Design an enzyme around this catalytic site. Structure first.
Site, short mmCIF file in Angstrom:
data_model
loop_
_atom_site.label_atom_id
_atom_site.label_comp_id
_atom_site.label_asym_id
_atom_site.label_seq_id
_atom_site.Cartn_x
_atom_site.Cartn_y
_atom_site.Cartn_z
N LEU A 183 0.88 -1.14 -0.04
CA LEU A 183 -0.09 0.18 -0.01
C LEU A 183 0.85 1.57 -0.01
CD1 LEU A 183 -2.69 -0.92 2.79
CD2 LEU A 183 -3.08 -1.12 0.51
N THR A 235 5.27 2.71 0.56
CA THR A 235 6.86 2.54 0.74
C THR A 235 7.43 3.67 1.66
OG1 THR A 235 8.80 1.67 -0.40
CG2 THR A 235 7.65 3.82 -1.19
N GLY A 236 8.65 3.26 2.21
CA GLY A 236 9.34 4.13 2.72
C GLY A 236 10.81 3.90 2.89
N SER A 237 11.62 4.84 3.54
CA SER A 237 13.14 4.91 3.52
C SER A 237 13.76 3.58 4.36
CB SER A 237 13.68 6.01 4.18
OG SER A 237 13.08 7.51 3.68
N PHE A 238 12.83 3.27 5.22
CA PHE A 238 13.37 2.33 6.42
C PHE A 238 12.19 1.09 6.32
CE2 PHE A 238 10.69 4.16 9.68
CZ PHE A 238 10.43 5.25 9.34
N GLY A 252 -8.58 5.39 1.34
CA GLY A 252 -7.38 6.00 0.87
C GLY A 252 -7.14 7.25 1.59
N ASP A 302 3.13 15.79 12.38
CA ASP A 302 3.17 15.12 10.70
C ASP A 302 1.67 15.42 10.14
OD1 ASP A 302 5.10 14.24 8.79
OD2 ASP A 302 4.32 12.19 9.33
N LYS A 318 -0.81 16.51 7.73
CA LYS A 318 -0.68 16.70 6.08
C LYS A 318 -1.72 15.85 5.45
CE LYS A 318 3.32 13.52 5.59
NZ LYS A 318 4.71 13.53 5.03
N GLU A 337 -1.65 13.68 3.19
CA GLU A 337 -0.98 12.39 3.10
C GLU A 337 -1.34 11.43 4.15
OE1 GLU A 337 0.55 14.95 2.26
OE2 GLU A 337 2.12 14.81 0.88
N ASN A 338 -1.38 11.94 5.37
CA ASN A 338 -1.43 11.25 6.65
C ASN A 338 -2.94 11.34 7.34
OD1 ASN A 338 1.08 10.30 6.78
ND2 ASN A 338 1.90 11.97 8.00
N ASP A 341 -0.03 7.28 10.64
CA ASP A 341 1.37 7.75 10.49
C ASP A 341 1.84 8.42 11.89
OD1 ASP A 341 4.03 7.82 10.07
OD2 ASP A 341 3.63 9.34 8.51
N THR A 348 7.45 17.58 7.65
CA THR A 348 7.43 17.90 6.01
C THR A 348 7.64 19.54 5.83
OG1 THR A 348 5.80 15.90 5.29
CG2 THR A 348 5.95 17.80 3.91
C1 LIG Z 1 -0.19 3.30 3.23
C2 LIG Z 1 -0.98 4.37 3.70
N1 LIG Z 1 -0.85 4.09 5.25
C3 LIG Z 1 -1.58 3.71 6.34
C4 LIG Z 1 -2.89 3.27 5.97
N2 LIG Z 1 -3.24 3.20 4.62
O1 LIG Z 1 -4.55 2.44 4.79
N3 LIG Z 1 -5.03 2.02 6.07
C5 LIG Z 1 -3.65 2.55 6.85
N4 LIG Z 1 -3.50 2.58 8.03
N5 LIG Z 1 -1.25 3.35 7.54
C6 LIG Z 1 0.27 4.16 7.41
C7 LIG Z 1 0.97 4.42 8.27
C8 LIG Z 1 0.99 4.00 9.37
C9 LIG Z 1 1.14 3.81 10.45
C10 LIG Z 1 1.13 3.58 12.12
C11 LIG Z 1 1.60 2.49 12.46
C12 LIG Z 1 -0.41 3.69 12.62
O2 LIG Z 1 1.64 4.90 12.76
N6 LIG Z 1 2.35 5.06 7.95
C13 LIG Z 1 2.48 5.37 6.59
O3 LIG Z 1 3.61 6.03 6.28
C14 LIG Z 1 4.71 5.94 7.31
C15 LIG Z 1 5.76 6.84 6.78
N7 LIG Z 1 5.32 8.21 6.60
C16 LIG Z 1 6.34 6.31 5.28
C17 LIG Z 1 7.11 4.79 5.79
C18 LIG Z 1 6.16 3.87 5.37
C19 LIG Z 1 6.67 2.60 5.77
C20 LIG Z 1 7.99 2.32 6.25
C21 LIG Z 1 8.85 3.37 6.55
C22 LIG Z 1 8.09 4.83 6.27
C23 LIG Z 1 1.54 5.18 5.74
C24 LIG Z 1 0.43 4.58 6.10
#
Ligand SMILES: CCn1c(-c2nonc2N)nc2c(C#CC(C)(C)O)nc(OC[C@H](N)Cc3ccccc3)cc21
Lengths: 18, 344
Positions: free
Chosen positions: B43, B45-48, B120, B160, B162, B164-165, B178, B195
């Site tokens: 769903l 991707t990220g740096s780590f 989304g 954080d 925005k 996106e979150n 996030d 950001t």
């Molecule tokens: C795909 C969209 N998405 C969803 C999600 N989409 O549908 N239902 C959902 N809960 N949850 C996400 C979370 C979260 C969280 C918690 C654990 C709740 O803090 N973090 C995101 O990104 C993190 C970071 N900004 C980039 C990243 C990503 C991966 C590794 C390292 C870094 C994206 C998320």
């Protein structure tokens, strides 16, 4: 227009902090 | 003209802190294992690491699963942030926050299993539709204001905010996601993170900041939702920071007088004059003209009809998410970073 400048900058897509 | 509904809100927040502190004191660990979940699709991707759609096999329930590479978390200096994220998530409870369902770790990775929100990100809907009407933007803003009121009362900073979150659920309501930079802070904190477009001046000036940076970010969010672009942008981040600290904001001509006034007070560079951070606190925001039509209790109760409901194509549909190329999750024979992630 400002909106046009925003489109012109390639930062309209998803932005990641890290 | 009745304010015994504030007495009830005060009592609500007192109960919320009691429940939070119990879970904060005695957190949950290794509540599941990786073989109990079926990996379906990436769903995000990220740096780590990466986030994946997953299916809990015994129950059939779909979830999101964040997978963090421990070595990469250490490398990118996100250890403390990852620990904050999990510990905070497991302790919090509010209608507009994504829920952590399970957490665990193995030799190579950390895992957080959470609510899947198929609607989304707000980001994609905003970019497609162009901009939201002020009533539409206000509907979402009201949920963020109540969420920050809840989080801040527990001494949590989100850091954080925005589009996106902010995920949009089946009812059209916000699910904040996030918690990567979420931190429990009484007083000040110093990490440069978030950001660029959404960074408060304090963060950029490297001086020490508090909860007020969240209220600044709300201003940026409300502006971007209503305008279709953020108040401070440029080709590179350094030019964005110059604009942020300058104390100059331009509003679109279609912005109402009320909206412009609220945003002037939220996008206040001087932190002693910023709405949310004055003596009346969040009530300065809630009592503002722009929110005059907002039924705050009805929003919390989810009784207000949403202006936008995303197209439902099933609980495991991912059409509101972009596609990513699929790498296998490799767990090493040797434990990595055992000491660093001990309390996870
Ligand atoms: C795909 C969209 N998405 C969803 C999600 N989409 O549908 N239902 C959902 N809960 N949850 C996400 C979370 C979260 C969280 C918690 C654990 C709740 O803090 N973090 C995101 O990104 C993190 C970071 N900004 C980039 C990243 C990503 C991966 C590794 C390292 C870094 C994206 C998320």
């Amino acid at each position: 227009t400002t909106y046009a400048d925003f489109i012109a900058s390639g930062r309209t897509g998803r932005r990641n902090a890290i | 003209k009745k304010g015994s509904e504030q007495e009830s809100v005060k009592e609500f927040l007192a109960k919320a802190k009691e429940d939070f502190l119990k879970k904060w004191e005695n957190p949950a660990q290794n509540t599941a294992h990786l073989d109990q979940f079926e990996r379906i699709k990436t769903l995000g991707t990220g740096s780590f690491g990466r986030v994946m759609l997953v299916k809990h096999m015994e129950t059939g329930n779909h979830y999101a699963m964040k997978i963090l590479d421990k070595q990469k978390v250490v490398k990118l200096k996100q250890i403390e942030h990852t620990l904050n994220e999990k510990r905070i998530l497991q302790a919090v409870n509010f209608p507009f926050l994504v829920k952590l369902e399970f957490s665990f770790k193995d030799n190579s990775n950390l895992y957080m299993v959470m609510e899947y929100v198929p609607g989304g990100e707000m980001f994609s809907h905003l970019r497609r539709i162009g901009r939201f009407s002020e009533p539409h933007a206000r509907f979402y803003a009201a949920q963020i204001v109540l969420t920050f009121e809840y989080l801040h009362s527990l001494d949590l900073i989100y850091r954080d905010l925005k589009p996106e979150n902010l995920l949009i659920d089946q009812q059209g309501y916000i699910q904040v996601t996030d918690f990567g930079f979420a931190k429990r802070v009484k007083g000040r904190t110093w990490t440069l993170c978030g950001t660029p477009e959404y960074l408060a001046p304090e963060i950029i000036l490297s001086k020490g900041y508090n909860k007020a940076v969240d209220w600044w970010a709300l201003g940026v969010l409300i502006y971007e939702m209503a305008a279709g672009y953020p108040p401070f942008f440029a080709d590179q981040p350094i030019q964005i920071y110059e604009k942020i600290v300058s104390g100059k904001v331009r509003f679109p001509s279609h912005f109402s007088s009320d909206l412009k006034d609220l945003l002037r007070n939220l996008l206040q560079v001087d932190l002693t004059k910023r709405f949310g951070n004055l003596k009346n606190g969040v009530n300065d925001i809630k009592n503002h003209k722009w929110f005059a039509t907002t039924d705050w209790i009805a929003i919390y109760q989810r009784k207000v009809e949403a202006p936008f409901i995303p197209k439902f194509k099933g609980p495991g549909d991912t059409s509101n998410f972009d596609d990513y190329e699929e790498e296998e999750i490799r767990v090493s024979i040797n434990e990595k970073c055992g000491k660093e992630f001990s309390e996870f």
